[PDB]
Amino acid sequence: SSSTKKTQLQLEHLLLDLQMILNGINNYKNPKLTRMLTFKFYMPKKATELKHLQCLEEELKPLEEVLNLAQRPRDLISNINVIVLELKGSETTFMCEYADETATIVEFLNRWITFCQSIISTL
Ligand SMILES: COC(=O)[C@H](Cc1ccc(CCc2cccc3c(C(=O)C(=O)O)c[nH]c23)cc1)NC(=O)C[C@H]1CCCN(C(=N)N)C1
Numbered sequence: 001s002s003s004t005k006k007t008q009l010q011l012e013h014l015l016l017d018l019q020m021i022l023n024g025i026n027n028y029k030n031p032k033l034t035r036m037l038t039f040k041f042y043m044p045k046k047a048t049e050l051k052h053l054q055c056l057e058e059e060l061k062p063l064e065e066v067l068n069l070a071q072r073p074r075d076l077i078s079n080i081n082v083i084v085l086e087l088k089g090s091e092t093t094f095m096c097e098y099a100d101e102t103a104t105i106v107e108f109l110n111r112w113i114t115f116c117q118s119i120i121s122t123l
Pocket of ligand 1: 041
């Protein structure tokens with residue numbers, strides 16, 4: 001249907017934005033890179049369903065913060081939040097469970113990229 005296709009395009013969009021941020025990291029210089037890798041992100045214990053996207057939404061602020069230091073990020077992140085809101089909706093009440101171990105921005109982006117590919121595959 002067109003409802004599922006709309007969802008699929010939204011996920012492809014979110015995945016692409018995440019991948020673009022990740023690719024940007026390849027160009028950051030050394031002093032800069034080292035500092036940024038010590039900024040920690042919180043990871044979802046389980047992220048296999050759209051509702052789990054709240055675990056990404058709550059981490060968008062810290063994401064914006066680090067992206068501003070390493071440089072518009074305000075616009076990009078806002079756009080990602082819009083996609084996330086569209087995908088999980090605001091009707092479902094789910095509370096995010098985070099793992100104990102925090103992670104670098106690289107692992108954080110990789111995990112959400114995998115999440116996006118995982119949902120896309122089930123469609
Ligand atoms: C207790 O706090 C900590 O140990 C660290 C501290 C910290 C570590 C690193 C940084 C920054 C970053 C940075 C990024 C990009 C470029 C640069 C930079 C340069 O450009 C340069 O001068 O070369 C200097 N510093 C930079 C800012 C804060 N902060 C974090 O780990 C951030 C999390 C803290 C809790 C809430 N957070 C969350 N994910 N929910 C974020």
